[PDB]
Amino acid sequence: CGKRSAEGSNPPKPLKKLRG
């Protein structure tokens, strides 16, 4: 047994950006 991958949300940065 060993390393377990980084799995599940975070949640990371937003995929996109709207310019206001």
Add this chain to the structure above:
Amino acid sequence: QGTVNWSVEDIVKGINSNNLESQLQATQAARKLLSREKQPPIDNIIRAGLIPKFVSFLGKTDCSPIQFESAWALTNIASGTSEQTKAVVDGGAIPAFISLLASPHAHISEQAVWALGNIAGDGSAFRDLVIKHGAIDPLLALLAVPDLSTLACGYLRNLTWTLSNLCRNKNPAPPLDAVEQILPTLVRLLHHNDPEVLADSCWAISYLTDGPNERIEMVVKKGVVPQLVKLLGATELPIVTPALRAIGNIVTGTDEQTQKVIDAGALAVFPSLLTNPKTNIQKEATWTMSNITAGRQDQIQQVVNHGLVPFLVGVLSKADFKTQKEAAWAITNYTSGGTVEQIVYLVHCGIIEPLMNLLSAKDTKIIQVILDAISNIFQAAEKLGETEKLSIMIEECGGLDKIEALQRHENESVYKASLNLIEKYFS
């Protein structure tokens, strides 16, 4: 005044006129519409069939202002759902935006950078399409300067962010050659002083390291681990978070890759990370620790020397349940590959009580982990004839009182592990 609150139909009227200036005004109006605080009518704009018109305005070198307006409008449409982003791509916007990266007007090429970011950020497919249309060279060329500090702050943040999206997504992961191309620049951005650039650079590295060991290797090979450990100590949470994720990803690799973060002094930051106010950092840090305890004994010994076992005990004792589960793992891994002396030390740090307390958790997975650990420890005491003394300790703090209760548990693997312990080590 004359570009404020236009109706989609007026925009259509102006854009369809045979007047370039009329088209410019209509396009700016479209842009302001798509830039309003909330619920921009992206679909209305799309149904009106305006995307093709905007894409064509992108190619009007003669009228840079309409290039900018249509670019901003297209950017915001591309910032929506996949369908909305698809609409932009289907309009032939990718090649048109790549051509604008060469514009003499910084604010225009910057808009192209942003749009390309939204398109790539949608997912693997559009990401790889952007790359196939040759975006990387132009993008990187924009950063080919003696000192990044001479670039406009926002301009640098946009390129960095867009590059991080070209590094984003996993099924499949970015093309290997594309990664190699981008990495050097990314390594330079990781040494820039602006916190947003650092955050996004760290996110980029976190994406590239979220995969097979070969992927982690091409990043480690660039020598960024030390810079990452440094950023790991940053005071800005937006930097520490992605930095920690990158470091956490790297230690899911080989023992050798894991040794690189240790050699860089990463362990010295964990007393702080493991007690961090932000629940998420605490969870990621404990998860990172668990993979380090799944390494070599000499690596488990580093965890020991840096005095991190007490911190693991502490996080197993009190913390968000998800962090505690990660703690459980760190313990089961530690006991699994650790030496007898190391497993004794863990007990001497007080691992038993908090470990027993968790057995009352409603989660079959954690229980299995904890039971495994109990088993691993007994096995070490078996090698010292101390098995009895251990039984007492577990007995002293309602431990056995809980293993028997689980001896009736529903889960297959559970009751079994439960039983064995009650007989093989008790009565």
